[PDB]
Curated annotation (Swiss-Prot):
This is Huwentoxin-IV. The keyword Disulfide bond applies. Two forms of huwentoxin-IV exist in the venom of H.schmidti, a non-N-terminally modified (HwTx-IV) and a naturally modified peptide with pyroglutamic acid residue at position 53 (mHwTx-IV). mHwTx-IV shows no observable difference with the unmodified toxin when applied to the TTX-S sodium channel of DRG neuron (IC(50)~50 nM) or when tested on hNav1.7/SCN9A (IC(50)=30.8 nM). In addition, similarly to the unmodified toxin, mHwTx-IV has only a weak affinity for lipid membranes. The modification Isoleucine amide is found at residue 35. This lethal neurotoxin (without cyclization at position 53) inhibits neuronal voltage-gated sodium channel Nav1.2/SCN2A (IC(50)=10-150 nM), rNav1.3/SCN3A (IC(50)=338 nM), Nav1.6/SCN8A (IC(50)=117 nM), and hNav1.7/SCN9A (IC(50)=9.6-33 nM). It inhibits activation of sodium channel by trapping the voltage sensor of domain II (DIIS4) in the closed configuration. The toxin neither shifts the Nav1.7/SCN9A activation curve nor modifies the slope factor. It does not slow fast-inactivation of hNav1.7/SCN9A channels. In addition, it has only a weak affinity for lipid membranes. It comes from the Eukaryota. Disulfide bonds join 2-17, 9-24, 16-31. Shows a weak or no inhibition on rNav1.4/SCN4A (IC(50)=3.9->10 uM) and hNav1.5/SCN5A sodium channels (IC(50)=>10-25 uM). This toxin has also been shown to weakly inhibit Kv11.1/KCNH2/ERG1, Kv1.2/KCNA2 and Kv1.3/KCNA3.
Length: 35
């Protein structure tokens, strides 16, 4: 269980699950795929 897609990321981790290449740095509060 980890914030993968559309999953909010805490400012302490921000490190999205390795289950998928998702980012949430400057993007939305939720992890989103890179286009």
């Amino acid at each position: 269980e980890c914030l993968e897609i559309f999953k909010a990321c805490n400012p302490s981790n921000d490190q999205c699950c390795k289950s998928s290449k998702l980012v949430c740095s400057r993007k939305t509060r939720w992890c989103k795929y890179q286009i």
